[PDB]
From a paper:
In binding assays and in co-crystallography, JAG21 has lower binding affinity to bovine cytochrome bc in comparison with previous compounds that we have tested. JAG21 “inhibits” Cytbc1 but not fully, indicating that it will be less toxic for mammalian (bovine/human) cyt bc1 than the apicomplexan enzymes. The electron density map in the Qi site of bovine cytochrome bc1complex with JAG21 (Data Collection Statistics) reveals an additional electron density, which allowed unambiguous positioning of the inhibitor. No additional electron density was found within the Qo site. The second aromatic ring in the tail group of the compound is less defined due to high flexibility introduced by the oxygen linker. The quinolone head of JAG21 is held between Asp228 and His201 and adapted the same conformation as 4(1H)-pyridone (GSK932121) and tetrahydro-4(1H)-quinolone (MJM170) by directing the NH group to His201 and the carbonyl group to Asp228. The carbonyl of the quinolone head and OG1 atom of Ser35 are within 3.0 Å distance that allows hydrogen bonding and enhances the binding affinity to the bovine enzyme. The 3-diarylether tail extends along a hydrophobic channel defined by Gly38, Ile39, and Ile42. The trifluoromethoxy group at the phenoxy ring points toward Met190 and Met194. The binding pose shown in yellow, which has the strongest density, agrees with the crystal structure and has the trifluoromethoxy group pointing toward Met194.
Numbering used by the authors:
A (entry chain C), B (entry chain C): 2 to 55
C (entry chain I): 33 to 78
D (entry chain C): 326 to 379
E (entry chain B): 22 to 229, 235 to 439
F (entry chain A): 2 to 221, 229 to 446
G (entry chain F): 11 to 109
H (entry chain E): 1 to 49
Write the structure that this text describes.
Amino acid sequence: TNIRKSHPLMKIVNNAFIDLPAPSNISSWWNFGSLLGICLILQILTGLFLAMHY
Amino acid sequence: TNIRKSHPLMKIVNNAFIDLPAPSNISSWWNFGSLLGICLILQILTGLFLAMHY
Amino acid sequence: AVPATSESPVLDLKRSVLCRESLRGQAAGRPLVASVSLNVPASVRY
Amino acid sequence: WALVADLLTLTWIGGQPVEHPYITIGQLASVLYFLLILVLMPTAGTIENKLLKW
Amino acid sequence: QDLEFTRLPNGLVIASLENYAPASRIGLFIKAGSRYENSNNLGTSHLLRLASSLTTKGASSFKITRGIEAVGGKLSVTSTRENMAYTVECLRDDVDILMEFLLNVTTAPEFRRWEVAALQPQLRIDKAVALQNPQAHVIENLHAAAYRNALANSLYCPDYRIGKVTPVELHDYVQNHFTSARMALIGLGVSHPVLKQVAEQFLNIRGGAKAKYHGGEIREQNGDSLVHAALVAESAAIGSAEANAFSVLQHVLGAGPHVKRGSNATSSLYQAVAKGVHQPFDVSAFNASYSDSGLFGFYTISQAASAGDVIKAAYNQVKTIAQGNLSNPDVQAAKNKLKAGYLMSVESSEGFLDEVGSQALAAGSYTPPSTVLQQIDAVADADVINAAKKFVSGRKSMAASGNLGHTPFIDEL
Amino acid sequence: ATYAQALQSVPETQVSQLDNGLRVASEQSSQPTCTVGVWIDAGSRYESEKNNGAGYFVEHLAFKGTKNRPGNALEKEVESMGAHLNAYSTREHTAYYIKALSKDLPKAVELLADIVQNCSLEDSQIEKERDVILQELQENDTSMRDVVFNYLHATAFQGTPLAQSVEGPSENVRKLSRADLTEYLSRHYKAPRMVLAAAGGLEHRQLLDLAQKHFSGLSGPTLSPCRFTGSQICHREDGLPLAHVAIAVEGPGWAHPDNVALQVANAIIGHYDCTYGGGAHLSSPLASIAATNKLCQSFQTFNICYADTGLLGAHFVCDHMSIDDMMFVLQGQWMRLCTSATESEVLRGKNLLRNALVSHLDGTTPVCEDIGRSLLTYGRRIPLAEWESRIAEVDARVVREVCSKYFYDQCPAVAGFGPIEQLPDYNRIRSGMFWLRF
Amino acid sequence: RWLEGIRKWYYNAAGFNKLGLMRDDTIHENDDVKEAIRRLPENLYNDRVFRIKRALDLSMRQQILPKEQWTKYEEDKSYLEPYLKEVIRERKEREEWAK
Amino acid sequence: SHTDIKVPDFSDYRRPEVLDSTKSSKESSEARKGFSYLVTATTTVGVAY
Ligand code: HEM
Ligand code: HEM
Ligand SMILES: CCCCCCCCCCCCO[C@@H]1O[C@H](CO)[C@@H](O[C@H]2O[C@H](CO)[C@@H](O)[C@H](O)[C@H]2O)[C@H](O)[C@H]1O
Ligand SMILES: CC1=NC2=C(CCCC2)C(=O)C1c1ccc(Oc2ccc(OC(F)(F)F)cc2)cc1
Ligand SMILES: CC1=NC2=C(CCCC2)C(=O)C1c1ccc(Oc2ccc(OC(F)(F)F)cc2)cc1
């Protein structure tokens, strides 16, 4: 057994990110979730850096 | 079976909050964790309300 | 040191026989022997 | 409890001006802080063990 | 190079051929087979067979595995109804390392409560595997049917005892059976004097009923499309001259195949059965021979519907051999098979060690291959007919497994 | 009397060749019994698509009579002298051999000669042995081990004669006429592609003269290399209770010296099943982990050798929930040996291999077969003293370097059969063939 | 020998005896101790289980036993030693073998 | 029989280097990995920048 399935933090990452069973056939329209996440993180960083000056 | 152990959100609450097995004999010194949580939430609320005016 | 003539699993469906030519050899002719080991897979004999 | 009392001393000394006798007390308290954690309390553990035939 | 032999005043046999091969096999043979269980400690010898490599006094459970594997070696434990055989192999330079382990395993096992209990499920694994062979079902039942007590014991632990073989029982079994008076230490590629000295210093350990034939039948109803079945009568004790006659009769009737995918033109039984029924089948003469007793008969494997026809056809063939229908060319062919079979069985240094040790327990000393062949020749045509006659008129024991709807009972035959 | 010494005084193997080109090979010792046989460079690799399984079909017909001994006469004569007659067929090697009394060696050699050369191949006997093979093919479908290995080859050596099964497709079995069989025979069964091997109580000189007497009539097709492909074949069948997985990289093939070092490495990882005495304390980390966590029911490392190529890897049988974990630990072992094998564990592997091949060659049959096949594959019998020299040459550095050649960052062939839902995706398997550190 | 005066003093000062505990109940459970506990016979294990249950219950109430009920220094058997000693002795052998 | 299964033709999909079934893939293995890993390595250098 591996320390991706064992470690309490890695376990959540391994199941929701790496070994997640995904349908074979999902299209480009399924990318938008990931992109929403990137947007949110992008806003938070840029935003925080702006808030250092505003 | 109950909807405390079933529901994905309640499941986390039921296991980490309600049916959590705790030692019978823990003293007053074990209260400080909960109190740290209250402190943190207290700071966040009061803080946010102050930030509306600062 | 050397692995046995057959790898043994429990809960595994067994190999079929459908002819005379594969079924001969099987009729027991002498009493049972039982070996267990460190290196070699357990197997019983006629 | 010595380590606690020492920390209470360091808090008092921290609040004081840099002069006699607060410099020397401060030095002596800071020595005792690291001495308690790195030497005395480990030694005390092993002494306790050998008192219990351990 | 030829074999050397010693029997010490304490009862123990040492036999060893120094042949200067690169590999060295050493075997400690003990009169401690399943037969020496009683109804209270059934399956103890089965656990004991699984139990080498548990912690000993001079070596840990860990050290036995690692130390033996370190030198590329092997440690095996082999049980019949009458004997247990502890065998070690390695490259010649590491014999006394393996010997140290073998002595520890056999003379001072600790059988620790937690280790012994941890081993319990292994009885189910080992049994489950073995009972995948339907021959194992039938032969184990056959004995249980044929005997009242010693040889009736199965080599595999009965279900009810799995999880319940105690440390005490394991200690008792070793203490009562693993003794100088019951032990033969056999070897290849090692000097006789050094074996003797080990046996004197480390195997001098102080000492610690007859098999009643019954005649019964046991029937496993299980709905296979094939029916395995065995029918035997009481034979003759190994060591007696009569036993040799049965061995010849076995090979007259047919005792397993000689040609790959062959139709067995010289096998008397196979042709007798193949005359009546042409669908998939196998038939062989069965011959077990023990210190107290023996079983001789035949084993059928037939289609469920044809089981009656096959068994009766096979039984009829023995009857005509018993009635006197048997020529010299048959008895000569049968002898040639048995003579060849014996020399071929001692061809490997594995099987040779097994025969040296096997003889050393059931009899006084080593009989050379040339003397054995002469004793096969000593069987007259008349002795073969008597063995067959004995089988026909003998009280029968039977066992079957399969869909037995058309398998007859003993009293239907 | 030491081990090093012992090897020097093992009986040498004798080597002679006939006019036609048949090699006669012999190992002698004062033994009452013997084994003698004919090995042939013939098998499924030499078969085309249209005649696949012919060598197997022939094997069925070999013992079913001759011109000199029609029908069961051949059979009867073997049986009545206590002899034991046997045959096998690999992808590259067909072999017929007889275990007999030493005194009966003349007749033994005679009968082998009669089988090979004067094989009846009767019309009714063909039609009989046709249905027999069809039922063996059905039996073979129930052996998951056989099925998965056939699949491994089929995908590993895809689009070549090595992808072909020994038995041939059912289509061929049902259609192969006697014309096909006899044409196959005269093309492949030739003296220079054949070896007469014997072991037991015999004078080499006598065998050679018996070869003259009966094998003189023997007459006197190059193998293309085989393209290995990184590929997967996944026969998903959830109805079966255990999963069979077979995985391998391209091996070097018979000739190559690296095979010795690879055997040492394969010995380190070793093999296991549920009836093994060792358990947790087993020396192989794969075995001890597999035993303690009940990952698999069984596994073995293999290294299968063919002419210019082979299959180097492992097979395992496990619970439907353990396939991913088995793969992870197995591939983890490959990587650990590649990158970081230790001296002491290589010494263990060496010792296993030394012991393996010294005790396998026990009694006349395995020794006869070693003679037969070694002459085909290597062109000689390699003595035990030479094997030992090759083994002593292997240290930790060697195991690393050799394993890294074949295992590290290389595309494997994967075959899976049964409840294989967990069996890792090929990309994940392929990524499991390297570490992000070394 | 001469420090036996201090050992007896420390014992009562430490005061686990006041909860009806023996010394080996107070051992912090590492991997070795876990295995040692796991190897205890039914009797010795169930005693351990109860003694702790009793101590925890007393701790819960912030009370001690009557002085008669306190574990006497002399009567404190070292019940876990034979199991623990061997567990450790075993692991050190595997650790050796690994090098 | 399971011997009836033979792997479909993947010629359409193969790299030129591994098309020839009578030649060993091992010559081209050094190369084929090089190409694909160069793409990955180039990408990483770009992302780094
Ligand atoms: C969903 C996440 C967010 C969205 C959709 C968002 C949206 C916006 C928008 C539309 C503006 C006006 C931009 C303009 O016209 O200049 C803005 C301004 C701003 N945001 Fe955010 N924002 C997000 C998160 C954050 C966070 C986390 C912070 C700070 C920690 C932040 C700090 C600011 C600041 C300081 C400004 C004023 C500077 C500016 O105008 O660019 N924002 N935001
Ligand atoms: C661990 C949590 C927090 C701690 C320990 C903390 C601590 C402090 C302290 C010591 C001060 C100076 C108080 C004074 O002397 O007046 C302060 C001021 C302030 N904090 Fe926080 N704070 C926390 C969280 C927050 C959050 C979440 C916010 C806003 C969302 C916030 C907003 C402010 C503001 C606006 C002030 C200036 C007003 C004031 O001086 O009271 N704080 N904080
Ligand atoms: C005659 C009986 C004496 C017993 C009673 C003691 C108190 C009487 C005063 C005597 C002097 C005490 O000593 C006092 O120590 C501190 C701390 O080291 C000094 O402080 C000085 O020394 C330290 C030495 O590390 C320096 O880092 C620091 O920069 C410097 O300010 C005071 O300048 C000094 O006055
Ligand atoms: C967690 C995810 N689940 C699934 C799919 C499609 C297929 C199946 C389900 C995804 O693409 C997927 C995912 C989601 C987000 C990814 O990047 C992140 C972006 C932001 C992020 O932070 C947070 F928490 F979302 F705010 C965490 C991750 C990467 C992958
Ligand atoms: C989650 C908890 N676990 C345990 C103990 C003692 C006994 C056993 C373990 C607790 O007292 C405990 C707990 C912790 C916090 C509690 O109140 C909160 C306070 C803050 C809070 O928010 C957050 F996430 F902590 F920031 C969430 C909960 C209430 C109970």
